[PDB]
Amino acid sequence: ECWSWESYLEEQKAITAPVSLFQDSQAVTHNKNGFKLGMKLEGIDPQHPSMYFILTVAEVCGYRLRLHFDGYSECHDFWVNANSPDIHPAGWFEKTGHKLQPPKGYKEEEFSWSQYLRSTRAQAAPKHLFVSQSHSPPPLGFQVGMKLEAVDRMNPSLVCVASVTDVVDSRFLVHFDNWDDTYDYWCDPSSPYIHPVGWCQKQGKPLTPPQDYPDPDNFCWEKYLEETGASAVPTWAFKVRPPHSFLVNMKLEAVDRRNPALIRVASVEDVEDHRIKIHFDGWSHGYDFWIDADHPDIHPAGWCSKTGHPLQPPLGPREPSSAS
C-alpha cells in the first residue's frame, strides 16, 4: 500500500513535468553522495553570499546534506545537494585568494587546516566530491570590478546599479554598490536578473542608483564610470536564457521552504517566464510560493526515490493546514 508516483497519477488523472523541462543538475539521480557525517569543508554563507566559512556535514539524506557552521549555533544549519556549486574542498580559499570567516573563537590568522583537523580530530571531505574548485573556465566577459544593472531579487520591482565582486568557476557575484552584501547573489551570464549598463534607459524603466548617491535624481552612468574608472560588462557577455516550459498542474517534487529537511509532492500552481509557483498537494494555498525554474530545490517526480531521500505524500483531507 506504499505511495508511488505511478499510482498517484492514475488516481488524480494527472501528469508530471517531463525530465526535459529541468536542468541536468536538478534531474541527475545516478551520482553517488560520498559526503559523510563529520567531514569538513568550505562554503558560502547562503544568507551572506560574499562570505566563506568552515562547514561540517551534520546530516546526510539521499543526495542532500545538512551543513553546520563550525563553532556557531545549529540554528544556522542549512541543506544543499551534493552537486552544489556553493561548497568547496579544504584549501580552496587559500588556493583561489579568497578570505575565510573563521570558526567561532578563532581569529582569521589563527586558522590553519592542518592544525584545525588535529584539534577537531576530523577529516576534510575529499576533493573528488566537489563540482566547484576553481578548475572550470570563468564566465566569459564578466570580471571583478565591471558594472551592470541588476534586479534586487529581494525587491524585484527594482533594477539597480551593480558590480561584479567575485568570480568562481562558471559564476559571478552581483553586488549592489554602496549597499549591504546580504543583498548580493551568485549568477551566470544567462541570468534573467541582469542587464547591461544602459538597459533601464533603453527600456524606459527607472534605475535605482547606489545607496545615498550624492544627488540621486541626476545619476548618470557615464559620470559614475569615470568617477570609478570602472568598465561596463560588455553587452556580448549577456546571454538569453529561454523561458521555461512548465505548465500549470504539472507535478514534481520540491523542498519544503519552512522545514528544508523535507521534500514533498508538488504541483505547478502558476507560471511566469522564469519562475513557477509551487503548491504542495493537500496543503493550504497559504504555503504556495514562487521559485525560479532553475532553483536547485525543485526536481522531477522520482528524484527522491532514485536518490534515497524520503518523499512526503500529500496532506490528508480535512487535516489542519489542508486544502480541498
Q: DSSP secondary structure string, 160-194?
A: EEEEEEEEETTEEEEEETTS-GGG-EEE-TT-TTE
CA dist., res. 266 & res. 27, Å (int): 15
CA dist., res. 50 & res. 255, Å (int): 24
At residue 275's C-alpha, the angle toward residues 270 and 279, to 5°, is 40
- What letter does residue 88 receive in the DSSP assignment? E
Contacts for 79-84: CB closer than 8 Å, 24+ residues apart:
79/255, 79/260, 79/261, 80/43, 80/296, 81/25, 81/296, 81/297, 82/31, 82/33, 82/34, 82/35, 82/129, 83/25, 83/28, 83/31, 83/131, 84/43, 84/131, 84/132, 84/296
Method of determination?
A: X-ray
| Strand extents, DSSP E, the chain | 40-45, 48-61, 64-69, 78-81, 87-88, 147-151, 159-168, 171-176, 185-187, 194-195, 207-208, 251-255, 263-271, 275-280, 289-292, 298-299
SS3 of residue 153 by DSSP: coil
Cβ pair 299, 251 in contact under 8 A? no
How far is Cα of residue 3 from the mean position of the Cα atoms in its chain? Answer: 30
Placement of cell 553586488 in the chain: 175
How far is Cα of residue 40 from the mean position of the Cα atoms in its chain? Answer: 21
CA 114, 118, 124, 127 dihedral sign is positive
Cβ pair 213, 178 in contact under 8 A? yes
Resolution value (Å, 1 decimal) = 1.5
Q: What are the structural domains, with CATH classification, of the chain?
A: 1-31+244-324 (2.30.30.140), 32-135 (2.30.30.140), 136-243 (2.30.30.140)
- When computed from its CA atoms, the radius of gyration of the chain, rounded to whole angstroms, is 22
Instruction: Dig out the grid coordinates for 157 from the structure.
Output: 520591482
